[PDB]
């Protein structure tokens, strides 16, 4: 009678480890595949971030250069005006003093 029970419980136990292995292995075929899919697309992005960064940094630089030329020229131009303006004021200032000193005479 027991002949069966031990054997049977043995036989089940087996297919119980069999189903188990089987899940565990196919879960692993699964992981492997995710690992791959990732290394695929995935990895390039790192270098893409890097290349993008460069591209931008040159653009900013180009633009900044342009802005610098502007600022500096305009700056040279504005100097002449500021000067001119200062001269006038000083000349003017002087004239009023010349006037009062003379009219209050």
């Amino acid at each position: 009678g027991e002949f069966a029970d031990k054997l049977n419980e043995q036989k089940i136990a087996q297919l119980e480890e069999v189903k188990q292995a089987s899940i565990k292995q196919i879960q692993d075929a699964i992981d492997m595949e995710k690992s791959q899919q990732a290394l695929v697309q995935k990895r390039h992005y790192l270098f893409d971030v890097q290349r993008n960064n460069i591209a931008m940094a040159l653009e900013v630089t180009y633009r900044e250069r342009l802005h610098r030329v502007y600022r500096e020229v305009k700056n040279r131009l504005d100097y002449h005006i500021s000067v001119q303006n200062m001269m006038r004021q000083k000349e003017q200032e002087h004239m009023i003093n010349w006037v009062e000193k003379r009219v209050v005479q």
Partner: protein, 66 residues
Amino acid sequence: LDPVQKLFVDKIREYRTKRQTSGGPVDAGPEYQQDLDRELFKLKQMYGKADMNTFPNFTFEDPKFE
């Protein structure tokens, strides 16, 4: 305040003699140049140490990465 009016006249005349004068700024006084130069110097401070009569040089910075 009708008498008061004939003073406008007196101002103009003196404006006139000044304006009629061509030989620098009228009644120099060495100070003028001094002050001038002083303010001419502040503007150098403001606008930079270059020859403002000249078009600018440019050597550009290399880009920078962080």
